[PDB]
Amino acid sequence: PSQLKKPRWKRVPTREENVIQCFGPRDFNHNMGDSDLVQNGVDAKGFPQLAELIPNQAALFFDSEVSTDEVGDNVQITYTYKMLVAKDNKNLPKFIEQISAFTK
Amino acid sequence: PSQLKKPRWKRVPTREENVIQCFGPRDFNHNMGDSDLVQNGVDAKGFPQLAELIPNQAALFFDSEVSTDEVGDNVQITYTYKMLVAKDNKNLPKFIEQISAFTKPSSIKE
Numbered sequence: 001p002s003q004l005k006k007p008r009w010k011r012v013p014t015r016e017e018n019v020i021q022c023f024g025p026r027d028f029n030h031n032m033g034d035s036d037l038v039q040n041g042v043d044a045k046g047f048p049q050l051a052e053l054i055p056n057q058a059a060l061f062f063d064s065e066v067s068t069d070e071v072g073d074n075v076q077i078t079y080t081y082k083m084l085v086a087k088d089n090k091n092l093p094k095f096i097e098q099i100s101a102f103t104k
Numbered sequence: 105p106s107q108l109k110k111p112r113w114k115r116v117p118t119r120e121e122n123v124i125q126c127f128g129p130r131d132f133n134h135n136m137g138d139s140d141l142v143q144n145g146v147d148a149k150g151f152p153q154l155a156e157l158i159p160n161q162a163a164l165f166f167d168s169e170v171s172t173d174e175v176g177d178n179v180q181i182t183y184t185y186k187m188l189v190a191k192d193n194k195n196l197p198k199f200i201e202q203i204s205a206f207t208k209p210s211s212i213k214e
Contacts, residue, residue: 062126
């Protein structure tokens with residue numbers, strides 16, 4: 001079955017069903033990833049190193065500010081998550097490069 | 105080997121090393137979870153239903169707005185992630201119960 005069969009928050013993009021197909025185009029509100037990341041998703045060779053700087057589900061849940069709003073027949077859940085990374089973290093420069101790569 | 109040996113964004117809380125130990129106390133900037141969730145972390149019996157409404161790491165990477173600010177010797181990365189859940193989603197009411205649960209503790213009846 002396709003990733004579009006799943007709720008948007010459970011999708012995992014790959015070459016076969018990519019970031020554009022699962023989510024949408026890169027834009028200022030959806031801003032991570034160069035064209036390699038977009039095309040290949042979690043299959044991109046840089047993804048495992050990038051994933052060292054992504055919170056896990058427990059951390060997202062317990063260490064976020066979470067808010068809600070009604071939008072038509074949905075409830076919009078906003079997770080605002082902050083993490084403090086040392087400037088000498090080995091994985092930080094690679095991740096900074098991917099922030100708004102679509103504009104760079 | 106303590107979860108405190110891992111970066112704060114990769115910790116997984118349990119009764120042994122709970123939410124307060126791994127993260128910090130519930131407040132308005134860290135607002136999810138009742139006292140059972142706080143005590144038992146991912147081993148709380150309510151957690152799997154809550155997990156149905158938490159994005160995965162690839163969804164959070166590719167489907168958030170991400171920014172950075174310098175804070176001294178560190179860089180703060182902010183993820184702001186928005187998801188639309190159908191009002192008839194059967195897992196939604198449990199999630200909502202947990203939002204700022206610290207404001208609404210159980211009365212003690214015995």
